[PDB]
DNA sequence: CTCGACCGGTCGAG
DNA sequence: CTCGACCGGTCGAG
């Protein structure tokens, strides 16, 4: 028996024995991992411990997926990690392309974070230095996916910060705090969401709109969701035309330019 | 053609056309993702945008893995995420079990973070309140995987903080700063590593041992690696018996108990 | 090459 | 049920 065969067979034995006896899969698989690693390092002292750990991984992956072929596994993980890093960029780019075709006629455009970074470096952004510094900090910490600007007196101003998520699933507990900081800094702060399934839970409606003990204030000025459900306070429906986002951006730009002192969290579109 | 067939065929077409023309796979796959999402939302207005995005995912995963079967993909990801969350726990538990069989005869034991959390809550840890508070902060932020204690005058003291990683690959740029804070707090701060391949790079030797412009000070008191390479300053070899870790723990406990003021980053085992 | 950031099913303990 | 933390090949721009 070579070390790899030994690990495969030993992990399976210890898992099965432990699971029949204690009836807890998570405890049993950890025991199988730990005890197979220890046993194999004893039975095979001259094999690198990292290689043994990889054989244990193989055994655990086979049990939990039914797939023993390390090439299949590698290929799926490679593809998944490709999607994980590129798809969010593709979706931001999509929003920018869709939004800019509509916003252009009102003097506005959406920028990627790297667009805004280059424009700040080329001194193309007219905001006050205090804003520029704050935006540079948001860019540094990768807080917002997109930014939106408005042209006024031949100068371009960033007035809004945008989170654009392909899953509204979970990221929103950690996305709310920086959105509230953007509202505190007197920027329009909004989110664009692909899937509204998470808003099934009352918790997530409360995270956006506020008004409960856990979530006293709204977390955004507006949340734009790709669905056909009617508006719930600051949770608005959009489709490929981004209509309410574009019409609210018009109003936000106006108020940011002319009455910015009232652009804290209380600001809401369509109230005038 | 239903929307799913449309997405599969359209992603493939746009990718291939764009890749032959511009010769950049990452640009081309993002264009295929963006333009297939837009095209499909137009061709299929009554399909939920999230479902379209899932069909685009399917197409991208098929191109990059060769696997079209969504069940295979789901099963591999499920298994991978199981390994990702449980294997690190199994390895910590393994170190605790291995270490404690040896350390017991010298009045020492290794605790999991959750062990130390329970013992602090049950007032079983004799450290000064200043230490207790600091440890509670480290537990809160999940900084260390394991802790080590020593019994003195019938009281148990935490004297060391331990990082225990199954890949020394990357985590170490982010693990160094909290280890240096533990040394600043006058605890023994060490790391136990499964795979030393990353120490091929001079950068990572420097991260542990210090003495360069990028890394002026050592990042740990000691790094214990499962390999047979001879000691490089504070990078020590171990196998399943953890020998140098156990012998250095003896010395660390002694010095923490009796001359703790000199247990900053400069402390090193075996120098007396 | 370097190197920081990305994700989401699962784990774990409520 | 809730809910915060885990990872590592890839992306992206050096
Ligand atoms: Ca309100
Ligand atoms: Ca419509
Ligand atoms: Ca030194
Ligand atoms: Ca040995």
From TrEMBL, chains A, B:
Binding site for Ca(2+): 239
GO molecular function: endonuclease activity; metal ion binding
Domain BsaWI restriction endonuclease type stretches: 123-225
InterPro entries from the UniProt entry: RE_BsaWI
Residues in coiled coil: none
CDD domains recorded: BsaWI-like (cd22313)
Superkingdom field: Bacteria
Key words of the record: Calcium, Endonuclease, Hydrolase, Metal-binding, Nuclease
Tagged with keyword Nucleus: no
Name of the molecule in the record: BsaWI endonuclease
């Amino acid at each position: 028996m070579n070390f790899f065969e030994y690990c495969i067979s030993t992990y399976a034995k210890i898992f099965e024995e432990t699971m029949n006896a204690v009836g807890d899969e998570r405890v049993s698989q950890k025991k199988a991992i730990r005890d197979t690693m220890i046993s194999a390092m004893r039975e095979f002292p001259n094999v690198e411990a990292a290689e043994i750990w990889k054989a244990v991984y193989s055994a655990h992956m086979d049990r939990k997926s039914g797939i023993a072929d390390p090439d299949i596994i590698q290929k799926v993980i490679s593809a998944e990690n490709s999607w994980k890093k590129s798809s969010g960029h593709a979706f931001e780019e999509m929003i920018k392309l869709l939004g800019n075709s509509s916003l252009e006629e009102y003097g506005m455009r959406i920028l990627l974070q790297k667009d805004l970074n280059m424009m700040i470096e080329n001194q193309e952004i007219a905001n006050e230095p205090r804003d520029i510094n704050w935006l540079k900090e948001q860019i540094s910490s990768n807080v917002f996916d997109l930014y939106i600007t408005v042209r006024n007196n031949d100068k371009e101003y960033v007035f809004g910060c945008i989170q654009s998520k392909t899953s509204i699933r979970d990221r929103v507990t950690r996305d709310r705090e920086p959105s509230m900081k953007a509202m505190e800094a007197f920027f329009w702060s909004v989110a664009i969401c692909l899937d509204g399934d998470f808003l099934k839970m009352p918790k997530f409606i409360a995270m956006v709109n506020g008004g409960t003990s856990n979530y006293r204030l709204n977390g955004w000025h507006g949340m734009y969701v790709f669905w056909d459900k009617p508006t719930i306070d600051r949770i608005y429906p959009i489709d490929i035309n981004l209509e309410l986002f574009v019409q609210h951006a018009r109003e936000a730009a106006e108020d940011w330019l002319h009455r910015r002192q009232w652009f804290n969290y209380e600001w809401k579109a369509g109230q005038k």
